[PDB]
Amino acid sequence: RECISIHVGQAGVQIGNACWELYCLEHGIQPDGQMPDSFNTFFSETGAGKHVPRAVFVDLEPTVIDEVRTGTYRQLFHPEQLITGKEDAANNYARGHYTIGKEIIDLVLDRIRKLADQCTGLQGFSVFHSFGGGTGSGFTSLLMERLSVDYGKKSKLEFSIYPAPQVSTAVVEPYNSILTTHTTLEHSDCAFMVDNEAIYDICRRNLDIERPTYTNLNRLIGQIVSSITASLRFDGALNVDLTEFQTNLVPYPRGHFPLATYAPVISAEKAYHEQLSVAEITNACFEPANQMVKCDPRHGKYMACCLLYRGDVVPKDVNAAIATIKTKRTIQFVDWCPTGFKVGINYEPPTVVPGGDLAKVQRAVCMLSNTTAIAEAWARLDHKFDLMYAKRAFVHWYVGEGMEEGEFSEAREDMAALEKDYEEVGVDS
Amino acid sequence: RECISIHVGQAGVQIGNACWELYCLEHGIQPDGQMPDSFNTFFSETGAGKHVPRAVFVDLEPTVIDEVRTGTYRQLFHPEQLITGKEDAANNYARGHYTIGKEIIDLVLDRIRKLADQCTGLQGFSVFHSFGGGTGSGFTSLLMERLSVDYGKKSKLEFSIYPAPQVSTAVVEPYNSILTTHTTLEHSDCAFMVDNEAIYDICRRNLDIERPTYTNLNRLIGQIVSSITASLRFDGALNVDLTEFQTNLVPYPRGHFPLATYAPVISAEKAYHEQLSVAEITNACFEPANQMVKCDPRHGKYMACCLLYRGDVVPKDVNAAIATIKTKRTIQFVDWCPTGFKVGINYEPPTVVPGGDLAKVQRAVCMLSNTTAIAEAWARLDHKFDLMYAKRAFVHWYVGEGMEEGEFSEAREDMAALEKDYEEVGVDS
Amino acid sequence: REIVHIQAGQCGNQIGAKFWEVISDEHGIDPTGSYHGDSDLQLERINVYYNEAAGNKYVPRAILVDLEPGTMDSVRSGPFGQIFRPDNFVFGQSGAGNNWAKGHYTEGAELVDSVLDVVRKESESCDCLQGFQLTHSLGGGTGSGMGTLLISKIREEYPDRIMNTFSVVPSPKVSDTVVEPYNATLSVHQLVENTDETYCIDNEALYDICFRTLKLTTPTYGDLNHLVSATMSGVTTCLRFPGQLNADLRKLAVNMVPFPRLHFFMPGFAPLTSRGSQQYRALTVPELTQQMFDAKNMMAACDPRHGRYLTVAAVFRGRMSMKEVDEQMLNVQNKNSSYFVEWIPNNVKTAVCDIPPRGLKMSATFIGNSTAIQELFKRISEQFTAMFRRKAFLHWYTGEGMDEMEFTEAESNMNDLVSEYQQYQD
Amino acid sequence: REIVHIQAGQCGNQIGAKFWEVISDEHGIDPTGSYHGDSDLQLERINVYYNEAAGNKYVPRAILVDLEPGTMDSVRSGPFGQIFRPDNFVFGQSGAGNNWAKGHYTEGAELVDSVLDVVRKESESCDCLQGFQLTHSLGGGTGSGMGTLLISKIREEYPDRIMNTFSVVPSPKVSDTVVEPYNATLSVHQLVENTDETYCIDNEALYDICFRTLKLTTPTYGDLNHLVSATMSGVTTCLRFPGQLNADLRKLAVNMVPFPRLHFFMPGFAPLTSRGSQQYRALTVPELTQQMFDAKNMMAACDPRHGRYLTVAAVFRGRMSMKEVDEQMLNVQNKNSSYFVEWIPNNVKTAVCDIPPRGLKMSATFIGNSTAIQELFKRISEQFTAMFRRKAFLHWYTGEGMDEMEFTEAESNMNDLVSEYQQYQD
Amino acid sequence: LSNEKKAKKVRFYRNGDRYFKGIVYAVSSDRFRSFDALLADLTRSLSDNINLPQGVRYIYTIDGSRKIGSMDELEEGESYVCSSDNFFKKVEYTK
Numbered sequence A, B: 001r002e003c004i005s006i007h008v009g010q011a012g013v014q015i016g017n018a019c020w021e022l023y024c025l026e027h028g029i030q031p032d033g034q035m036p037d038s039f040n041t042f043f044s045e046t047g048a049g050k051h052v053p054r055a056v057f058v059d060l061e062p063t064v065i066d067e068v069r070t071g072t073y074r075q076l077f078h079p080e081q082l083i084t085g086k087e088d089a090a091n092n093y094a095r096g097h098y099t100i101g102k103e104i105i106d107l108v109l110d111r112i113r114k115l116a117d118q119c120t121g122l123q124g125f126s127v128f129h130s131f132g133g134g135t136g137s138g139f140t141s142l143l144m145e146r147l148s149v150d151y152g153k154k155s156k157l158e159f160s161i162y163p164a165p166q167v168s169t170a171v172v173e174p175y176n177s178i179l180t181t182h183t184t185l186e187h188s189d190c191a192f193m194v195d196n197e198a199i200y201d202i203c204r205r206n207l208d209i210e211r212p213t214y215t216n217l218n219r220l221i222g223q224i225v226s227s228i229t230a231s232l233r234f235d236g237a238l239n240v241d242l243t244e245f246q247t248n249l250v251p252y253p254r255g256h257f258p259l260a261t262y263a264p265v266i267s268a269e270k271a272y273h274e275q276l277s278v279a280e281i282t283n284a285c286f287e288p289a290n291q292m293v294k295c296d297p298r299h300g301k302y303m304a305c306c307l308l309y310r311g312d313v314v315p316k317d318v319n320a321a322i323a324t325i326k327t328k329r330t331i332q333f334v335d336w337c338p339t340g341f342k343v344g345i346n347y348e349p350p351t352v353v354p355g356g357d358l359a360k361v362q363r364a365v366c367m368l369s370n371t372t373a374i375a376e377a378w379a380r381l382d383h384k385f386d387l388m389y390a391k392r393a394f395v396h397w398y399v400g401e402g403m404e405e406g407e408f409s410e411a412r413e414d415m416a417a418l419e420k421d422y423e424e425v426g427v428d429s
Numbered sequence C, D: 001r002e003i004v005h006i007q008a009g010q011c012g013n014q015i016g017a018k019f020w021e022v023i024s025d026e027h028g029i030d031p032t033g034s035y036h037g038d039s040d041l042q043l044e045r046i047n048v049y050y051n052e053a054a055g056n057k058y059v060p061r062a063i064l065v066d067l068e069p070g071t072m073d074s075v076r077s078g079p080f081g082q083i084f085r086p087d088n089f090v091f092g093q094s095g096a097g098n099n100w101a102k103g104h105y106t107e108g109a110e111l112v113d114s115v116l117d118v119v120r121k122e123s124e125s126c127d128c129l130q131g132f133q134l135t136h137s138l139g140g141g142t143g144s145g146m147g148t149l150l151i152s153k154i155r156e157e158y159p160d161r162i163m164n165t166f167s168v169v170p171s172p173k174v175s176d177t178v179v180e181p182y183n184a185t186l187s188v189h190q191l192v193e194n195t196d197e198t199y200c201i202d203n204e205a206l207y208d209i210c211f212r213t214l215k216l217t218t219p220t221y222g223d224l225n226h227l228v229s230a231t232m233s234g235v236t237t238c239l240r241f242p243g244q245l246n247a248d249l250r251k252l253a254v255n256m257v258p259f260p261r262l263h264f265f266m267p268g269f270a271p272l273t274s275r276g277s278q279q280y281r282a283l284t285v286p287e288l289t290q291q292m293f294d295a296k297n298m299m300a301a302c303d304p305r306h307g308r309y310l311t312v313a314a315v316f317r318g319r320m321s322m323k324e325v326d327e328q329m330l331n332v333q334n335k336n337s338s339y340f341v342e343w344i345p346n347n348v349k350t351a352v353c354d355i356p357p358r359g360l361k362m363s364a365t366f367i368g369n370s371t372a373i374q375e376l377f378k379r380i381s382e383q384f385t386a387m388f389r390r391k392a393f394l395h396w397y398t399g400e401g402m403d404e405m406e407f408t409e410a411e412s413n414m415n416d417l418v419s420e421y422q423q424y425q426d
Numbered sequence E: 001l002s003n004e005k006k007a008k009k010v011r012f013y014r015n016g017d018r019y020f021k022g023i024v025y026a027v028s029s030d031r032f033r034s035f036d037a038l039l040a041d042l043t044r045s046l047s048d049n050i051n052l053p054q055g056v057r058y059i060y061t062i063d064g065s066r067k068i069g070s071m072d073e074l075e076e077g078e079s080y081v082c083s084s085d086n087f088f089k090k091v092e093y094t095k
């Protein structure tokens, strides 16, 4: 029934604090834990008057988890559930996975085994990491790694924030992301992806603001995510379990990575304008300028979409708005796939931050999907890697951290067959 | 019905003052003796206002018993019952047992014969000593010695604080503990053991505090002990007499030494957190990081456990929480033992010091048991001995105190068959 | 006589709430209340769907099978939800994965025994059992897989009592799921070989019939369901009422199935007029046959006009002339001699109850066994191959302990089933 | 007629409080009060369990034997605790050690004479004695040892009056003691050779039956006890009521014991439904036999379905048709011909009281003599050997003046007892 | 085209039952890392207290001649017996 969550890496933690915020916000549970089953699949009723968090937090520098235990919400989690390794983060996979990151893992696991026990027939762990980091790429790599073995019998949906197409940060980023992909690939169930840059566009083009603090992108994913777990694990006219996803969403064992998209992104101050039609939002979903991912459907044929709706929506409206789409053709779906549209309908409309910059409509569409499109995104990220590896660039930083020419070269070959995979499962009939 | 207690050795006296504190504290009897049968098995209703203790205190330096007759509680005992030998303590068995300790014994006994008479059909003497001391090892050795003969027809449960595995104090410690074991072995009924160091861990790991004063460890045993006598000799839904123990707890005449363990050890300041489940505490009992003894079940197969519960507990909850355990297998119980689980249920929940550092739950599990584990603890403590004896080290200190190459060598051979005993009764089928 | 409804899956379940929402009122049974029945006739035959315990508590004798708690916990936490004895709820808190294989071989196979258990407690209720009603969707786990199992077991336990199946065959235009043809082809397979009366409904054949035959602009699911439940009430329950010429499941079965496949029908209700205005009352009778026999108005997706009929059963329920009934049916059989198959002199099976749908004057359920439904299993069967060929989302099946020959089997079977049906269209 | 209860040990004692808690209310006897009896029939036969002294003080005629003061001093310091005449309390302030040997040869052997003394004061009470009720646990000192002695003496003093024994045989999964099989094997031995009717209850067969047949989430001991005491009331006391067809200890004995061993039964109560909801009232009768004869619901650990029956005694107590009773029993005997042994044309012993359990409409105690209980003494007997082999905690016995041949004896005996019981399963 | 061989379908029976038609379970490398893990789940699915002492400690052959220690010994559509301490009674398992 439930779904634990492990927010790994400063980022996965910032995004975590965010997604975690939106939560209580739409569940009437003040930062003090108290509200005045349903949603029990994400919150344990420690008694008692409180709620607490049904997740954990893993960063190797204290800085970021520290800030959580300062700002209201400080009261929300258990002093315990926020894991730290005073040591060093290191923007390098190796160190975070092998060398350092190792020391903490046990302890980490312990919670996802201590928190996994306390519950009642769970469904999986929504993992939150930032592909191109040290604690986010490496660590998790083995966290998800140690999970796939300790609970192979569950769902492993990892929600990632993969490398901005041109606006990356770390100098090595690809090293860290070609490595988190190959190690997690054979361990995840469904990997959701939200592109940091391609989200900015949305903040520039669909909300207008050249002042987007990280604290915003987080509010956004913090939204799209709320549409995944939160509301879905919440009763409705067309419920969709976590398993449901991976089933209706992955055509093949590769921990396939769909893309997250939201429909109503419109800025407060617009807040009064006449609302958008069920048809418009539906249509907005097929626009490559509103998908939290720089993977513009440049050719990538969709192969399965899970249209999660929430708010006031008439099933016919959908079983029509989608019909219209199924026949737009310029939206070309894979061949071997007749119908690939999982319509998920929830009741409770979205819930926008009291005064951030999100419109606040009475219905939204968080559609996610597997698109032969990422054939690109992976490509462009793989190429990166080579260029540097081709010269070993910052290689001495990993080797000296318990890695080898193996893990790199052998994780490169890995993704290679991910460029062929995402190519074969499509483009051909 | 009752059970006298003889706190021997400064330590056994410090721990005594502690266990003795917790008592009145949960019986509404201010330090003035007055409260405003049941518990009569530990307190005599002397005069018509008071509650004179039901034990005695034996130390060869005044310092420690002196402090009792300064600090409130000063009013609690009878000026008489606190025996002292102004002379010298001496951190050496010999002197305390033979030479000096001898002079006092008579007098000592007299009280445990004067206090043993006054009562009504007693059950035994809960003895409190500190294995590796002078007054604690030696003396008692002959105290328990002179008891096994004067009242062979009773229970002799000695509650010991055996030598910290690496953090011992006295330089000789083993000499004093291989000697208190061999002399008491053929005289005790059931010897409870609480490891001083392995309790610190609990204060570091399960309560958090690098500032643990002896006065704390004492509050702890002062707790686990309260679960033994106090509450048990106190009515309940599944009473357990002292005899009960030794019967359900010792498979063989060797004054077998079970280990004390408590379930709810959580620090005040945590005091508000949602309480732990009947299942969790039960499970906490099978964790080698919560047992007041550095005898981590490294292999030692349990052979009998006396789960004493107290507070709000449903017999099914137990006759289930235990069932779940009986089938964890990784908790491997001896062969020749089908079922070795004495479920002791009391009513009144625990009673934590007003403001020490103990959580204060509404239910706890003071489980004690005989584990083939001590095969270790004894081993590691025996080896110690040899090393020194192998060179006579501080031998001249005992010889010159009425002992001989006999008592040592012949008490070494003694324990030897305690390393074989605790080996044979287990590890084999 | 009697029957024991079966709410397999969510859909089949969601509908349960509507089938029972209705039926009850068509039998004066309030939530937990008793028989408030405006009349006295809505009681002499109730047994068919309830049981006597208290004396005001006639509890629906159905089964609620589902591997997703939330669902039954929405049906049990709403309106009439508190009438079913808890014993009826056979839940499977497991992961109700959308896999036919996950609810038929791995997850459902466990929860089955704890179901059959009850399906026997209800069957061995009392008097004489007739058959079981089965609701579900052939486009999911708990529906097609686990419900299709429930029957394969039922039909081994009482190959005597009948088995009506109400399936929500995967609507064309848009599929409310992705593997749909997988979960479907696999369940139809099980159907063509266990139940002996299937009434296939299409969420979009309904919309249409619900947005143009009922100017209804916002046809919520509740509605669709409601419309469907309206037909299944005319069928069963109805005939368990008096009538100049009454029939019952068997008659319906023994007059509608020329060849053992089991064959699937397509239900159609009679007065289907928009509220206010339309309330034309043009219901003398030629108006009902006008209705029932038109293309639109067939809960199925396919259009009768696209293939002969083998049998038809106008189960009317409202005082009318055995003459204006028996007569109309004829002209109808002659104006359309073209499509009505010939080797059956009188395809039509006129049935006639007396008491009509509570608030209406005259209605008539239509149960057509037309060869047109060929053009649907075709559809389904197509979708399969187009995706089977590439083993699309097959790993979710096999990885659940399935077989590459299992899918082959079903398609073929159900695929042949298309073939046969044509053997009569010609 | 009459009987004199015997509360051996703590358990047997703890239960005394529950057996008398009940029984009294089933006889309108308040703490020290008299007969407030809602009726007038709960009095004409009380004698069976009380005595006339004052005129409002009918004191339970039982014995409270125990070597642990605290216990009886908890039963005597609580609710109904102040109804037993102090003379009844035969305590042994000694060390009630958990050793069968300590309460049968060394410690108990002393307190015995001061018991028999009273067991005679009560027997020679008045009218005619029938037998004695004995409660205890075969997993401790004062229970298995001292109580098993109390009988060996009783059965020498009146080899005429009967001896029902209510034993709490050592539950499987988890034992509430360590030597358990020692204290047990040794007491069963004494049982198979003195008492002639034993009703074995299992603390975990109860939990189950109390946590799933009574959604009861926190089944305290009081409960278990309470459930048990519910059965022993249906047995005795009950039959000492009128009935179309009434029986009494003997009938029960003379219809249930084919072969002198004494044989042990397994009691089962009838209406065992959870409070609020479940209060289905499905108690016409087929519902009671449905109950009673299922696996779960047998206070024993073993499952009947695992071995034929020799005899059965449905001691019903609530107005019903000697037809729907006598009848049901039959089908039951034919649906399960498999397990019900054949060399007994009518295994079942239908019994029928009139007045039911105070607040209920219809109940029926079940006393089964199935060969299934073979698979329990096996258990016990196993545990012994596995530990006897190494003389585990044997020094606590011998050191108490025991014999290495004593343990041998019992095991064998009780071990053979397993053998025999199979002689009929075949 | 990656290499794979799916899991293994087996019919698990509890030694000494001659009544319960055992329970079917799937076994692979992704579900159970070893026999101990499988046995762990088996205890829960077969959990009892009549035919199986502690539920399920070991898995024996349909005949009980030898107990399986490695998953590699489990073949598809196989028949296994659950043991712990009790001996084999040889019943009509597959009969």
Ligand SMILES: Nc1nc2c(ncn2[C@@H]2O[C@H](COP(=O)(O)OP(=O)(O)OP(=O)(O)O)[C@@H](O)[C@H]2O)c(=O)[nH]1
Residues within 6 Å of the ligand: A008, A009, A010, A011, A012, A014, A015, A060, A089, A090, A091, A092, A096, A130, A132, A133, A134, A135, A136, A137, A161, A163, A164, A168, A169, A170, A196, A214, A215, A217, A218
């Ligand atoms: N959406 C979003 N992206 C973020 C956030 N914080 C960081 N990122 C992105 O995630 C990556 C940064 O990872 P880092 O913060 O360097 O590292 P980490 O993954 O936390 O772990 P370490 O390298 O050991 O410190 C960059 O691509 C950032 O653009 C955030 O709050 N929201």
Ligand SMILES: Nc1nc2c(ncn2[C@@H]2O[C@H](COP(=O)(O)OP(=O)(O)OP(=O)(O)O)[C@@H](O)[C@H]2O)c(=O)[nH]1
Residues within 6 Å of the ligand: B008, B009, B010, B011, B012, B014, B015, B060, B089, B090, B091, B092, B096, B130, B132, B133, B134, B135, B136, B137, B161, B163, B164, B168, B169, B170, B196, B214, B215, B217, B218
């Ligand atoms: N838990 C606990 N352990 C104590 C306490 N006091 C001392 N100990 C331990 O007991 C041993 C010390 O014994 P000592 O105080 O040296 O000696 P004694 O046994 O009182 O007798 P003498 O040697 O004659 O003074 C060491 O192992 C200490 O760690 C106390 O208050 N609590």
Ligand SMILES: Nc1nc2c(ncn2[C@@H]2O[C@H](COP(=O)(O)OP(=O)(O)O)[C@@H](O)[C@H]2O)c(=O)[nH]1
Residues within 6 Å of the ligand: C008, C009, C010, C011, C012, C014, C015, C096, C097, C098, C137, C139, C140, C141, C142, C143, C144, C168, C170, C171, C175, C176, C177, C203, C221, C222, C224, C225
């Ligand atoms: N008429 C109708 N169709 C429904 C309802 N619910 C789901 N469906 C249809 O059922 C299919 C989905 O299967 P679903 O019921 O979710 O499967 P399951 O719940 O896993 O057994 C889609 O084709 C939906 O249109 C409903 O309440 N009424």
Ligand SMILES: Nc1nc2c(ncn2[C@@H]2O[C@H](COP(=O)(O)OP(=O)(O)O)[C@@H](O)[C@H]2O)c(=O)[nH]1
Residues within 6 Å of the ligand: D008, D009, D010, D011, D012, D014, D015, D096, D097, D098, D137, D139, D140, D141, D142, D143, D144, D168, D170, D171, D175, D176, D177, D203, D221, D222, D224, D225
């Ligand atoms: N049903 C039931 N069992 C009990 C009660 N008390 C102890 N037992 C059982 O009796 C066994 C222990 O023996 P005990 O009664 O303490 O022996 P004694 O008191 O020395 O004679 C365990 O198997 C317990 O589960 C009770 O009140 N009810």
